[PDB]
Amino acid sequence: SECVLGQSKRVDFCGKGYHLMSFPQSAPHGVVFLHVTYVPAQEKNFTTA
Amino acid sequence: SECVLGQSKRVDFCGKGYHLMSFPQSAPHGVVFLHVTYVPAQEKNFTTAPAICHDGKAHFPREGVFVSNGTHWFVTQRNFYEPQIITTDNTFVSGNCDVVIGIVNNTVYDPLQPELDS
Amino acid sequence: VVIGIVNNTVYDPLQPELDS
Amino acid sequence: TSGWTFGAGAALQIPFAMQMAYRFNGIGVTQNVLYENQKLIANQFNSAI
Ligand SMILES: *[C@@H]1O[C@H](CO)[C@@H](O)[C@H](O)[C@H]1NC(C)=O
Ligand SMILES: *[C@@H]1O[C@H](CO)[C@@H](O)[C@H](O)[C@H]1NC(C)=O
Ligand SMILES: *[C@@H]1O[C@H](CO)[C@@H](O)[C@H](O)[C@H]1NC(C)=O
Ligand SMILES: *[C@@H]1O[C@H](CO)[C@@H](O)[C@H](O)[C@H]1NC(C)=O
Ligand SMILES: *[C@@H]1O[C@H](CO)[C@@H](O)[C@H](O)[C@H]1NC(C)=O
Ligand SMILES: *[C@@H]1O[C@H](CO)[C@@H](O)[C@H](O)[C@H]1NC(C)=O
Ligand SMILES: *[C@@H]1O[C@H](CO)[C@@H](O)[C@H](O)[C@H]1NC(C)=O
């Protein structure tokens, strides 16, 4: 209801990283979610104020 | 806690549609919630583009999407049709035109130009 | 069209002094 | 085809690029970050799948 039908701000609910969207997949006696998430990478330092 | 005492972004957690609020009602051995929700209705098709190419610069919507009624392009909020003229106030610029797929030429009106002549 | 409206001036920061 | 909308009510079609663009906008990343590098995003998603 929250990951497939919408986009959730809940951290680590719909997979690690910032949640973009999810895809459900049927499985025997269960369900499988493919959580598409945005994770940042390639950092670099900056001075800030 | 999350719907009577607040407004929930969780989809279909408190009633179908976009949640506005809920009202609790006592029931024997339980509780009844009256989930007030905003359900969109009466949609109509529009042609859209992700961004608008002004003179060598690509304009994106700050909030909403670009749409057209067939001939004229408007920027409107995503979940209620309230068309408005494209201006530099409701759009922001990032990069040149050719990098974005689906870019469309259209003029973006600077409100300062007709205001200032003296 | 709106109920509860109250008259008041809204200042324009684009032209309080900036005319040329 | 419609993203988050069919959960709320009648399914409203939208191009998938614009849908993923708003979903980027939902996580605090502007739309131009997606549109300017849509091909890389699509390739990354395909590779992950
Ligand atoms: C930032 O500075 C720290 C300490 O000077 C250094 O260890 C690190 O490699 C720098 N770069 C990043 C991305 O943290
Ligand atoms: C949008 O266009 C399609 C195809 O022309 C049509 O099937 C559909 O009913 C249209 N939607 C609306 C809301 O008119
Ligand atoms: C689109 O809207 C503009 C401004 O409201 C109007 O002048 C024009 O005739 C409209 N065109 C169509 C096809 O509805
Ligand atoms: C949209 O699809 C049509 C038909 O497949 C194609 O001619 C056009 O170039 C496409 N435009 C974009 C921006 O994908
Ligand atoms: C209008 O758009 C086309 C591509 O759709 C582009 O080649 C052309 O340069 C644009 N017009 C101007 C005046 O830039
Ligand atoms: C508030 O109610 C009074 C009457 O009790 C009415 O005169 C006034 O216009 C109302 N104001 C608003 C903003 O509804
Ligand atoms: C002040 O408000 C009243 C009632 O809302 C309205 O009739 C009147 O026109 C307003 N004043 C001016 C100068 O418009």
CB B8 within 8 A of CB B2: yes
CA distance D29 to A38: 10
- Which ligand sits closest to the CA of B57? 5
Sign of torsion, CA C1 C2 C4 C8? negative
CB contact under 8 A, D7 and A18: no
List Cα–Cα distances, B73 to B52, B83, B113, C11, D22, in angstroms. 9, 9, 20, 30, 20
What experimental approach yielded this model?
cryo-EM
Specify the residue for token string 């806690």: B1
Q: How far is Cα A16 from Cα A35, in angstroms, rounded to an integer?
A: 8
Which chains form contacts with chain C, at 3 or more CB pairs under 8 Å?
B
Tokens 């969207």 appear where? A21
Nearest-CA residue for atom 2 of ligand 1: A45
Long-range contacts of residues D8-17, Cβ cutoff 8 Å, at least 24 apart? D8/B11, D8/B16, D8/B17, D8/B18, D8/B39, D8/B40, D9/B16, D9/B17, D9/B39, D9/B40, D9/B41, D10/B40, D10/B41, D10/B43, D12/B40, D12/B43, D14/B48, D15/B48, D15/B50, D15/B102, D17/B50, D17/B101, D17/B102
